[PDB]
Structures are given as C-alpha cells and as structure tokens.
Amino acid sequence: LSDAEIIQLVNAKHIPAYKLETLIETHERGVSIRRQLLSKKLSEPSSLQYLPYRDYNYSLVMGACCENVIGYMPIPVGVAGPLCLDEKEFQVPMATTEGCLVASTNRGCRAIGLGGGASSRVLADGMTRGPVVRLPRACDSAEVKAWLETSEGFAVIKEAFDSTSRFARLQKLHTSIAGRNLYIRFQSRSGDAMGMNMISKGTEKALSKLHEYFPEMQILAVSGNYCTDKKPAAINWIEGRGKSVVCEAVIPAKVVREVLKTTTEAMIEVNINKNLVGSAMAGSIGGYNAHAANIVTAIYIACGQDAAQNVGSSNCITLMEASGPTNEDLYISCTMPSIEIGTVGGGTNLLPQQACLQMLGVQGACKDNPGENARQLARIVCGTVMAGELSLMAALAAGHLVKSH
Amino acid sequence: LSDAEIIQLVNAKHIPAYKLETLIETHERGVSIRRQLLSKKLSEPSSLQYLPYRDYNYSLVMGACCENVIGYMPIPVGVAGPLCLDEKEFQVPMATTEGCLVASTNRGCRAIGLGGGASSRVLADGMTRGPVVRLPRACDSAEVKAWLETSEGFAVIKEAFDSTSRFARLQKLHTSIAGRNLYIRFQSRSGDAMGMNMISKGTEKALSKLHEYFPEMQILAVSGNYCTDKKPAAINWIEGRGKSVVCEAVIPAKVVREVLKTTTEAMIEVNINKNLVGSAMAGSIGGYNAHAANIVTAIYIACGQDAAQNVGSSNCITLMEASGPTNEDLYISCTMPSIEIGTVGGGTNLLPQQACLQMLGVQGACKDNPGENARQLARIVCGTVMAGELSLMAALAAGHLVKSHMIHN
Amino acid sequence: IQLVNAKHIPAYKLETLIETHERGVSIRRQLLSKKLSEPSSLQYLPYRDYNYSLVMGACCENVIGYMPIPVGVAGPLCLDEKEFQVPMATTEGCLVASTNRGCRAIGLGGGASSRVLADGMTRGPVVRLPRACDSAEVKAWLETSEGFAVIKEAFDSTSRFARLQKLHTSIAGRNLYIRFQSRSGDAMGMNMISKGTEKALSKLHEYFPEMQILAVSGNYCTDKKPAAINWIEGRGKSVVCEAVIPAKVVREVLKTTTEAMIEVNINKNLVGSAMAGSIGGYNAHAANIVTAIYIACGQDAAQNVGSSNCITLMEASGPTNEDLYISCTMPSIEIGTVGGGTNLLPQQACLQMLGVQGACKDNPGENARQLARIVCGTVMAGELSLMAALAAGHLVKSHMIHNR
Amino acid sequence: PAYKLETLIETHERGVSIRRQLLSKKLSEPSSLQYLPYRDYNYSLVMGACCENVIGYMPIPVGVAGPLCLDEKEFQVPMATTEGCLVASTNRGCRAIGLGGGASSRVLADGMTRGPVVRLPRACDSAEVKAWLETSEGFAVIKEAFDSTSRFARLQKLHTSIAGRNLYIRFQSRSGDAMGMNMISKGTEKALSKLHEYFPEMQILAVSGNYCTDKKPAAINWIEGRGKSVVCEAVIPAKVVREVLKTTTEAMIEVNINKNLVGSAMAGSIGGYNAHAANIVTAIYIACGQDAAQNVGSSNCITLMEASGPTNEDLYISCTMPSIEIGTVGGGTNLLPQQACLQMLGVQGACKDNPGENARQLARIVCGTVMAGELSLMAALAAGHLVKSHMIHNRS
C-alpha cells in the first residue's frame, strides 16, 4: 500500500515499471513511484528534482500520448500578433526556447498589419500513406498497377478504404513500380484530424481487399516510405502532403524602412541569392526559405501537433519582388505544399494545447464544416511563416542577426 | 498598483505588451497582466484558462529563450531504457504527445540489451555557417576562392574567426561559386555548445577581415543558406554538420523472435525495401530510415535542444543484415551525419531541461574536455534512434503498426 | 569567297546563294579552314556523299560535314519471346562487349520480360497572375472537368496524334507552373507537345486576360535537366523489365556468383547512390546503354539526362536461392521512331534493324513503345555484365584490354 | 565467335563486311543494312580502344557556331547534332557575346573521381579506417600507391563517408589532359590494395560504389565538383539584346529567375538550374570524341542574369558548371574525325609543354558555348519564338 511497499512488491522482478498505473488507482501516484524507482538507477539520484510532475492531467495522456511517464517538460509560450490574415486578426501562440523567435515573428506581423494584411489560400488537402507490396514478377506488379488505374479497380479500393472511418475519404492513388515491388500512395481527406492513424487504418483495409483480387500479393509494410512521413522526400514537395497552402502580402516602402529597418532592394537581393541560389548551391529539395521550420516548430509544440513532422511541414519557397509605383514596395509570398496538421486527435486532446488552439478559434472539430478548423490552422501557420521570413530576411539584409539572438 | 490600473496605464500610453516585465517588478505578474491584456483580444476570452503560467522560473527565460510570454506548454516526458551503449547504461528521457513512441523505443532498448549492447563512434564534430558574399565579377570571386584556398589565406581567416571565443576553433572551409557570388562554408568546433550563435559571431569577424583584403567584396548575408541551417540540404548529408555519428548492435535470433515478434529475415526484407528502395522511389536525400525524426524530436524537446533542427539532425541511414555463425542474428547500424546538439546554451539553461540532461550525465560544460558532454549526448541520440528503428521495423514486419496505435495512441 | 568576305556575308546563308547542298558545305569548309590555327585540320572530318537535303530544315545548320560514330551490335536480346540485334554507337571500348555478354546471360536464362507502364511526353510552362489568390483560382479552374476539356480541345487541335491526358498544376506565389502530359503517337513529341501547349495557353488567356505567359518552358517539364518530377511522375515512357539468370550461367558467363552480385547491387546501386545524394541514379551504367542506342537510332542524345533514370534491383531466386533475379525500372525514357534524327537514313537503318522504324500506321505509338522496351531490356543486359565485372574485380583489367 | 573476325581475317574492313553478312541473316529486314555506312573508315584505331562487334558507323551532322569570343581568343565551335535550331541558336548567342566584347572564364578546380565501396567487420572498424585516411600520414601512403600507376594521375584529396560497416572513399585526382576514368580507376585499385595491407579485414566490394559519381545524377558532383569546375560571364549591350536577341534585358531576367531558379526548384532539380546546357555539352562531346553518356553530370549548370549599365539596360550573364568531365587524349579522341574537331579548337591531344592545359581549355570553351546557348534560348522563350523556330528548322 505505501510507495515503499509497492516498490518492494514490484522489485520482486515481478512487475515492469511501465505497468505501474495499471496497479494503483491514481495516475500521478504511478508517475511518482516510477520516478522513485528511476532515481536509484541514476548516477546522480537527485537529477529529477527539477523535472516537474505534480498537478497535471495524466488521465488524458495514458493510452493516447505517452508511456512510462515521469513528468512533463514546460516549454515557454510567447505570443506574436495580431496577424492580419484574410480579414481576420489572430494572436499566435509559439512554444520555444530560442531567444528572438517570438520577437522577430511579432515584428513580421507588425509589418504585415501596417501593410494592409495578408491573404492566403488552401490549394489541396490530403494526408497520405505509401505501403510497399510485392508480386511474384514485375509483369504481375505491372498488372496490379494497371488494375488500380481503372475506374472499377479504384472504386473497389475506395469503398474498402472509406469504410474504416466517418471522415477518411480516398481521393486518389499514385502508384509506382520497382521491378516486382509496387508502392501505392493512398491520398485521402481526414476531416480536422492530421489523419495518420486514420489513413493507415484505411490503407490496411484497402490492401486486404486488393489481396482478394491478387492473392499472390505480399504486403511487406503498411509504410514503405512512399508517403512520405517524417523523412525529407521530393514526393511531398511535388505532389503535396496534408495541406498545400499559399500566402502573400505587400509591405509599403515606409514600413520596410521603419519596422523592418531596411529597404525593399536589399531584401530582394538577399532573398534571391540566399533562398533561391543559396538553397540551390546546397542541394536543397524544398528548402527555399530562411526559417519556416522555426515558426512551424513553435506553433506545433504550442498547439499539440506532431513536432517530428516539421521535417516535411516546413517545406517552403519564399519569394520576394519589387512592387508599387516606384518599385519600392515589397511583394512577398510563401508557398507550403505539405503542412501536416490537425485540430482533433493526438496532442490536441490535451487541455493546455487545446487552450492555444482556442486562442486561434480552431480547437477541435468544425461542426458546421468538417475540416475547416484544420484548414484555418494551416492558413495561420503559412501566414506566420511569412511574418517570420519577413523579419529574419530584414535582419540579414541590415546585418542585425548576431546582435540580437 | 492594481492589475486593472496597470492595464489602464498600458492602453492609455499605448505601451508594448512585450515591455511589461521592465515595468513591473515580478516576472510572473507581468505574464499575468499580459494574459489579461490578451484575453480581451480573443474571440473566446476564456481560452487561456487551461494554459498554465504559475510557479515557473521566468527569470531564466527572459532575455534568453522567449519574448512576450503568456505561460508554458507541458509536454509529457516518458523514459526508455536502459540503453546499453559503449559499456554504459542510459535512461533516456523523451518528451512527446505521440502514443507508442516511448513504448517502442523502450522495446528496442530491451532488444539491444539482451543482445549484449550497442557500440558508437563520433566521426566528425563541427557546426557550420555559410554566408553569401559577392564581387563585381565572377573572375573576382574566383580570385577570392583561390585566396581562401591558400594556407596563408586560411590562416588569416582562422585567426580572426577564433578571436571571438575561447571555444570556437575554425577547422576548415568549403568555398563554392555561382557566378560573382561566393558561398563560404565555415566549419568549426564549439566546445559543448550547439554553436550557431558562437559560429555566426566568428563568421562575422572573419568576413570583416576578408573585406580588408578585398574591399570591393559585398557581404550580402551572414547566412546564405549554404550552412545549411533548418532546411533540407544535400550538403549536410554529404559533408556533415554538427556531430557525425555511427552506432551498431547485433540482436540474437531468439530476441528478434520473442521481444520483437518477427524474424531477422523479415526485418532485412522490410529494411531494404522500405528504407532503401522506398526512400529512393520517394526521391529522399538523407531520409533512409523509418522514424529517426521521432526519437530526435522527443529527446531534443526533453533536453533543451532546438527542435526546429530536427530537419537536418534527423538525417539517417539505417542498415540491416544477417549475422552470426548460422546467419540467424540481426546486425543493425544507424549512421547520422548531421546531429546538431549541445549541453550548454539555449534551452539547456532552463532547469527542467537540465534535469533531463543530468539523467543522462551530460548537463553543462565538460570542464576537463570541452565538447565531451555534447559528443556523449550525440552518441546517446544515435543509439536511441537505433533502438527506435529496431522496434518500428519489427512492428511493420509483423503487421503490428496500426494495432499498436489503436491501443496506445 | 572574296564576295562573302567583302559583303561580310554570314556562312550559314551559303546554301541560299548556291544551288547544291554539298557545294555549300564545301565552300563553308574552305572559309572556315582559313580562320583556323591549323588550316589542314578539316582534312580528316568527312563530308562527301552524304544527303544534306534531309538535314537542312530539320536537323542541323551551318553544316561542315559529319562525325562517324562506330556502331557495334549486341545480341540476340531475348525479350518478350522475340530476339533483337541491338545497334550501339559509341567510342567507349568494352561497352558493346559487356552488353553482348549480358544478352548472352539473359538468353541462356530463358529470356527477359518487359512492360510499358505509362506513356506521356510533357511540357511545363510558367505563367503569372497579379496575385497568388488569382493563380490559385486558375489552378482550381484547370482542375475542373470543364476547364480541362476546353484546354484539351485547344491542345489536341494542333495535331493528328498529340492527345492531352492530364495536367499537374503547381503554384509558387503568383507564379503557376502547368505540366501538360500528352500522348504523341510514335514521336518523342517535344515539338508536337510544345505546339499544343502554346495553343492551350492562348486559350486559357481568353479566360484569364490578366495572365502573363512567361515561358512555354518554365523547367517544370522537365526537359534535359535532372529533376525529381520526372523520376516520380514519369516522362515519355515508363518501362520495367526482368529476368532470372541460372546460377551456372552467373558462374560461367558472368564469372561471379549470385551472392556477390546481390551484395554489390545493394551496397552500390542502393546504399552508395543514397550516400552520393542521387535522385534517380540507382543503377550502374544505364546511361551508357541509353546514349549508345540513342545516337545509333536518331534519338535526342541530350535526353540521356532524364532517359537514363533507372533503379536496378537484384535478389536470390530459384529452388535453392542460387539463381539471380534482376529487374530494371526506367520511369522516364524519352524516345520516338518518327521526327528529329529519325528522319535521316542511316539512323532509319538502325531502327529497321530493330523493326520499329517510322509510324505504326495501324496503332500510333506502338513502334516507339517497342523501342522503349528494347532500351530497358538492353540496359538490363548492360547492368548484369558491369555488375558482374565489378563483383569479380574485372573492370580496370577489361578497360586496359579494350579501352586504351 | 563473330567478335573475333578481325583476329583471323586480314583487313579490318573485310571483318566488318563479314560480320554484317552474318548479322543480315538474323534480321527480319536485312536490307536495312544497305543504308548503314561502313566502307573506307579507319577501323584500326577503333579495335582495342573504342568499340567491339563493329558493323559500320553512324554519321552525325556537324555544324559550326562562332566565333566564340572567349578570354581574348576566338573559337569556331564544332557541334554534332540532329536537333534543328541548336547550331543556329548557339551561333546567335555567340554573335550576341561577340558584340558585347567577349566572355571571360576561369577554371576553379580540376579532379576526376572514383568512389569505391569497401567494408569492415564492424562500424567501429570502418570508423577507425576513416580516421586513419584523414591523417596526413594515411593520405600520404595512399597517394604514393595511387600515383605510382601513372605519370599523370596525381591524387589531390579524399572524401570518406560511412554507412555502418561500409566505407565509401571518394578519390579525387588530376589526370593530365585525359578525362581520366580509366587512369583514376587503375590508381584506385592500387590504392585499395595498399589500404588492404594496412587493414587485412577490409573487403573491397566494388571499385565503383557509386560515390564517384559517374554517369548518374548525384548531389555530390554538384557540391564537390567532378572533373573541371568552370565559371564564365559576359555583358550584353542593351542594343544587342534588342536587335540580335529580339527581347529586353528585363524580360530575360524575369524568365531566368522564374524558370532556371524557381521552376527548377519546383521540379525538385539538383544541379539543373539552366535552360539547355545539356544540348551544348552533348553536341560538343559527340563532335570531339568525349564520352557522351557523361552529359548526365557534365551538364550540371546554374545560369544567372542581372541588369547592368547606367540605366540597368545591359544584360549581365554567368554560367557556373562544377562538373565538366572532359579530355583531349584517350577514348574517342583517338579517332581521326574527332581529332579534326579538337584541332579546330586548338586543343587536340596532349599539351606537351603543360599537361592538362588542353583539357582545361576545352572545358572553358564548353562553359562559354553553354552560355551562348543559354542566352539565345532564354531570349526565344522570353519573346515567344521557341515553337516557331523549331517548325522552321526542326521539322521536315
């Protein structure tokens, strides 16, 4: 009954630490006991003292977001804004430990606001899963590909795929062959969820159905890296993954001068030679921007997104052009083809992250139009990336990078 | 003064919300006031109710880690281990909201442990900065490239570069031309720091010195994306950035079967067709792995690293093959050429993150040998990625991916 | 001559003045020789008894002669129950010998099988609208079945063979890149497709008068530059071929073992290409085969850039897993049997050796499709032989013998 | 054995004649051979160096573009092609450059490479080998073994990368006037044999492990260079852009940025930041006995354009090609017609006084000609003249 007694009972080599909660009836106590057990295995027993753990809702975490829990990690949250986007104003929450990130993003928002605001559009929406399957011969895999490309073959596959969820709907298939191997990229809507588990479940049922028509087919892995999830890949850049978005703004010369502390000409010379030529010299696929990843990461951590998806979600091409009467105003656009995001599921099930989603008006399911909350969040991310690009690029043009962060 | 009064003064004097801490005495109250000012601008005024802010040390955060602070975001931290690596045992902290991640990584550690442990080696260590400068003509930039390629030219540059720090020591230069533009990749050690600020500071000094020899040289940007920082780039994959690490282990056939629920043969087939052929089909540069990004991200967030660096720090090639007298055992290796990490600076200045660094035995500076703590952390990251790769690949091979996520995610 | 040098007349306009193609070439050679450091240089560059009338207006300008490229033959290549004698134009010693060796291994193994997976040449122009919100509108428009229909009608009206199949539209702010993919009969199709694109864009401009057409090619095709889009989406013909080589053949013909071949294939064509940061280059030397057949058959040799895209795979097969299974997948073979260099006689001769010259009157596209299958199958033969030489340590030795 | 005909018979020509007769019987259309030329060609120089099982030769039309005014010299550039408009377009670009006062170029680097794959029992062992290779002493003994195989192959550096227990070693070496693949391969084989003496547990898997990288697109070639890395530039007068190129400097720049930078980025290109460098490279290569299959990496190029002059009306242009694989001795350059084209450029054979200078000069000509090609095509694209020019010169 006491923690000490429980620690002894467990230590009889009888019970693994990860099973503590399913033994006691209070999540926090399981965490407390795991911490005690862990302490005696550390070269510095008192190192956990500064890792917080009390008064946190572990009931929402267990069975959904983390195992073998020992506490939580507080990440400072700052706010940038208002971000004037599509005739609305957003106060953007950003979780980071990088000094100057929030300040810089706030400054970009200020330049956009004084510039009359930004406009964005969602160009596409579809999470993907790319399993790898194999047939006895390439002649066979070629036949399966041809079958999948017929309207009836696709129809059969879509029915099986769509049956696994209320929101997952198969839009298309991109099939690629490597000898007897066949990589099938399933692309589907997923309501307001980022959709990975949903799409994977749909894929699983669709492959089972395909097997009925081709019993010789061997499913090697539900993910054959053709999705592509959490690894850099030209396929995400070119075909899109999740939400594809574009945003733009014109910053008046006076604003570029007073808020950004530079000139339109200087910003354009840096953008072309850094974000286009520089990224090209570095052999980048999708990295034609200054720091989209910083903004994507901060918003993702703050809003319960999958931070590991910053790998592909940060894909962005930032463009700048002289505009206006005397070509002294700055036109800027950011195009992000693969923002993997959601307002339902995963980390968005937790209360603090729901608070940040509420701050933006996109928490949970959009009752009146499924998928609209996720689309709106993707639009906010793209616009905030643009605000960040504006400020960092201005700092680089003026020579202010080092002097601040 | 009261909260209402402080607010009225703010609005009235049109005062920046970000300057509140310089106005009030206590940091927490400034955050409270900021939250109050913000609540009035929200469509849902009660939004901040469940966003915590009390009892946190904001003094360490201000002027170093975040601005316009409205609270903190708690990320669950779990533990995977022991990770048996280089004759040592590590208890690895992982901050995540992805169910199954800690369980899977823990399973991989268990497999590695029953197999006698993993071995790792740091192959290179050097953070980089790649500014872009321009000359009047390409014939001029070609001259500058030649000059930087001389032992004497490199000497003068190294001298200026190193003068900015007790730890930043320039190791080499990689210079490339694009017409009249010249991209110079400075590569330098940085003690136990990730080094981005340190290196940028040294680069700025070296460029000023370069300018004394070539006054017609225009310095366009201290970062010309040739570093490359926080964007996918072949240069990081091929030349490395930060720490280049390799690790390996052999998992006995019995362990692959009982712990991983599959076979060495199935593991190899999935690895080759997914991590090699699959990534090739997808057009990946550096993504020849299953989920290195998951492990990298979780450890980074737990240990005060820069999570946005997951972009390049996640580069990894995971390889598997048959081993042992009967070729029944599973040999696995993970090679990560660009792990950007540090144990001093940035978020590692915060106490909770120092707690996770302390669990690993790598918090702060290694006074006896600057850089040893950061190197050790890089080894732990590579070994943990390897544990994670082992478990996910096994789940993919056995058809357990979706099922496991239905239970824990 | 004194005339030309006086009036400063350009050498390229010589054929107009003269009434003989060959005499125009002769006089151009004389003018050129005077300007050279060594005037006797042109002596060994042949020009006589060649039909310049076929070249003029179709294949080359300011002509001074022709360059003979040695042509060798490899085969029989036993593919899809047919046997081919493949002509290869090259100056690289060992290439024909090695390819011939691969054909022999394939033949003793019972032959190769191939399939054409897709067929569509592309053109990717770049256009721009005043704003990104405007370009997004055009992209949505092109994605409606009605929008696509009007664009297709305009495109297809420029030709009896070019038939638009699909569009892939992508945005970069206010810029819009539109990848037109179209069948092209037996032609490689670049001119046909560019013509169709030009007409299609004019039609789109009727609907969006604020649209500026920047360039008929905005590099989103992509033609003659390495690009992930060709590797991923295909371009021209996507083909796959395979074969199983008996263990005994691998030892006797290839001088190696199935295990050694597999180990080299995985660590070189997969792991090494990944270490090198390759997109589409998961093979040993597909480019050598493609180039040699292309030059021999009047193809556009500059398209070796993307046509060479290939992933070569190897695995153990058979009763005791001692036989060698091999497959080569080429998603972007840009090829044709009508148009361009295929209008010339010697190159038509090489196409005729393969039985694919000119138009397949009863089913346009069949001759080009067959040629694409032969290319893929020949690449596979070449892949087998070079990989065996690499596994056994024979590369440098063979080149000292046949390539020096 | 048909390929041994020349061994038994007298004349090379008769052997080709007989092989052709043998082949005839295997063709479904034997009369096709009637239009494949074979008579009166120097087969002696071909056998043992450039081709096997020879049945004749393929004539490729050769046109000339120029003069190309480059580095205070003038070159008449030979181009073998069947693409109508190519020579005309390249000639126009040359004309524009000449009227602009000529182009200037620089060779930035020179080193052919070979990237074998070897393997050790463990990654810990491969890590040790990598570290040894990174010492001046390790490099020194490897260079000694490598260099002993040639009078021209001189090892310059090594780039070693591992993937677990596998080790990829990129050897970079000078090669006199030769493109150097054979020379570098021979040096690599000896250097690996020596490395094995230091590390007996090392398995040499393949002399080429695709880390070179030869004839496959690869970021390593783009970033580190291969063969010759060259840059070229010129300024075209406003009146010339208008009169010769039929366009404006502003239109040129706009097309260049949006096609060659943005468009190539959209397509996911690594090294393809140009309009048609591959066309020029391929035509010169075929005419000059180069290895046309190397157009894969030799074509790598970034083309840049900016405004110049008092009112920004002149056009500045530069082309940067980091991986031109080329040579003036060896391979196809052993044949007479291709030697005639190399002689046209003044770079045929060995530069006896300074080995390496003829190949370096040829690489500069290639970069300069690509730049002339880029200028003309970009102008045609900006002006809307592409399709029209090809209907005129590239269609029977």
Ligand SMILES: CC(C)(COP(=O)(O)OP(=O)(O)OC[C@H]1O[C@@H](n2cnc3c(N)ncnc32)[C@H](O)[C@H]1OP(=O)(O)O)[C@@H](O)C(=O)NCCC(=O)NCCS
């Ligand atoms: C730090 C930085 C924002 C200061 O900008 P500045 O123009 O020199 O300083 P200013 O006092 O003139 O303020 C300009 C704007 O910056 C923003 N800003 C400045 N300091 C800020 C802070 N401490 N907190 C929040 N927002 C801040 C404000 O939105 C805006 O002023 P206003 O809304 O009160 O009218 C700028 O130097 C910068 O962004 N550099 C770092 C850029 C970067 O992105 N670094 C790499 C990624 S972290």
Ligand SMILES: CC(C)(COP(=O)(O)OP(=O)(O)OC[C@H]1O[C@@H](n2cnc3c(N)ncnc32)[C@H](O)[C@H]1OP(=O)(O)O)[C@@H](O)C(=O)NCCC(=O)NCCS
């Ligand atoms: C969830 C999962 C770990 C369960 O594995 P399993 O082998 O079927 O279950 P077992 O009960 O036999 O446990 C095997 C091992 O897993 C680990 N493990 C299992 N459940 C665990 C949990 N809830 N918490 C922590 N560790 C756990 C243990 O190290 C070890 O058990 P042990 O106490 O005997 O040493 C497995 O399905 C998995 O890893 N799936 C892949 C998830 C994944 O990697 N997704 C990728 C994105 S994170």
Ligand SMILES: CC(C)(COP(=O)(O)OP(=O)(O)OC[C@H]1O[C@@H](n2cnc3c(N)ncnc32)[C@H](O)[C@H]1OP(=O)(O)O)[C@@H](O)C(=O)NCCC(=O)NCCS
């Ligand atoms: C030169 C090479 C073909 C000789 O192969 P080999 O097996 O050692 O020699 P063999 O005498 O046993 O002949 C085996 C087969 O090779 C082929 N072959 C060999 N020499 C040949 C030649 N001179 N001409 C044409 N075909 C030849 C034949 O198809 C076949 O012999 P066969 O008449 O009995 O049917 C081989 O060493 C090789 O392929 N190496 C170079 C590989 C390569 O691809 N080079 C790099 C890219 S070009």
Ligand SMILES: CC(C)(COP(=O)(O)OP(=O)(O)OC[C@H]1O[C@@H](n2cnc3c(N)ncnc32)[C@H](O)[C@H]1OP(=O)(O)O)[C@@H](O)C(=O)NCCC(=O)NCCS
């Ligand atoms: C065909 C093309 C060269 C005609 O150019 P143009 O400017 O309209 O025609 P012009 O009569 O005004 O001649 C202009 C210049 O072009 C060159 N030129 C034109 N026709 C030529 C021909 N038939 N042969 C050789 N050179 C020619 C000349 O060098 C130069 O004039 P000059 O030397 O007599 O003083 C041009 O339309 C073009 O280059 N388009 C094709 C572009 C291309 O690169 N094709 C794609 C891949 S090959």
Ligand SMILES: NC(=O)c1ccc[n+]([C@@H]2O[C@H](COP(=O)([O-])OP(=O)(O)OC[C@H]3O[C@@H](n4cnc5c(N)ncnc54)[C@H](OP(=O)(O)O)[C@@H]3O)[C@@H](O)[C@H]2O)c1
């Ligand atoms: N295993 C993997 O492949 C993988 C890969 C990367 C990340 N992840 C992890 O997966 C998690 C997110 O997965 P997920 O996005 O699919 O969440 P999920 O929690 O697995 O699925 C969403 C659930 O919410 C329900 N739902 C209700 N209203 C909805 C609405 N409006 N829109 C959408 N869904 C609604 C859905 O119903 P239905 O049951 O009817 O669909 C479904 O059960 C994260 O933790 C991430 O880290 C997993």
Ligand SMILES: NC(=O)c1ccc[n+]([C@@H]2O[C@H](COP(=O)([O-])OP(=O)(O)OC[C@H]3O[C@@H](n4cnc5c(N)ncnc54)[C@H](OP(=O)(O)O)[C@@H]3O)[C@@H](O)[C@H]2O)c1
């Ligand atoms: N601006 C950018 O370009 C950029 C880009 C990406 C990330 N970042 C951010 O940069 C931050 C990290 O920068 P940083 O890694 O350079 O840390 P840093 O805090 O800026 O620099 C390290 C400091 O610690 C001192 N130090 C003491 N003992 C040391 C030891 N053993 N090893 C190393 N340094 C020691 C150094 O001395 P000296 O003064 O003598 O050097 C130096 O002052 C993160 O928050 C990250 O998010 C910045």
Ligand SMILES: NC(=O)c1ccc[n+]([C@@H]2O[C@H](COP(=O)([O-])OP(=O)(O)OC[C@H]3O[C@@H](n4cnc5c(N)ncnc54)[C@H](OP(=O)(O)O)[C@@H]3O)[C@@H](O)[C@H]2O)c1
């Ligand atoms: N400018 C560019 O865009 C570009 C780019 C790369 C290469 N090229 C060059 O383009 C040339 C090849 O162009 P192309 O392939 O479009 O050839 P093409 O010669 O321009 O067009 C083929 C012509 O043959 C006719 N034709 C008759 N029977 C046919 C059949 N069965 N199949 C197809 N066409 C048939 C076509 O009819 P219709 O008139 O009814 O269509 C058309 O007039 C090469 O020389 C290449 O180097 C050009």
Ligand SMILES: NC(=O)c1ccc[n+]([C@@H]2O[C@H](COP(=O)([O-])OP(=O)(O)OC[C@H]3O[C@@H](n4cnc5c(N)ncnc54)[C@H](OP(=O)(O)O)[C@@H]3O)[C@@H](O)[C@H]2O)c1
């Ligand atoms: N097998 C492969 O790895 C491979 C790959 C791609 C292409 N290739 C083929 O390789 C062939 C060319 O190979 P290579 O370039 O190495 O030529 P090479 O003909 O194999 O070697 C050049 C020979 O010329 C001698 N030489 C005399 N004067 C020279 C000078 N000034 N500069 C350089 N060498 C001089 C060299 O002397 P030393 O004996 O003292 O060195 C050597 O014997 C082409 O046909 C190409 O298609 C082969």
Ligand SMILES: CC(O)(CC(=O)O)CC(=O)O
């Ligand atoms: C400045 C940068 O490193 C990002 C950062 O400071 O966090 C990105 C770049 O512009 O290269």
Ligand SMILES: CC(O)(CC(=O)O)CC(=O)O
């Ligand atoms: C399973 C995976 O999606 C990662 C995850 O679940 O978080 C990665 C993959 O194998 O593609």
Ligand SMILES: CC(O)(CC(=O)O)CC(=O)O
């Ligand atoms: C051997 C090779 O260089 C091609 C050749 O010899 O022409 C290709 C390779 O395997 O890297």
Ligand SMILES: CC(O)(CC(=O)O)CC(=O)O
């Ligand atoms: C015009 C082009 O296709 C090349 C050619 O016509 O041969 C290249 C381009 O995309 O600009």
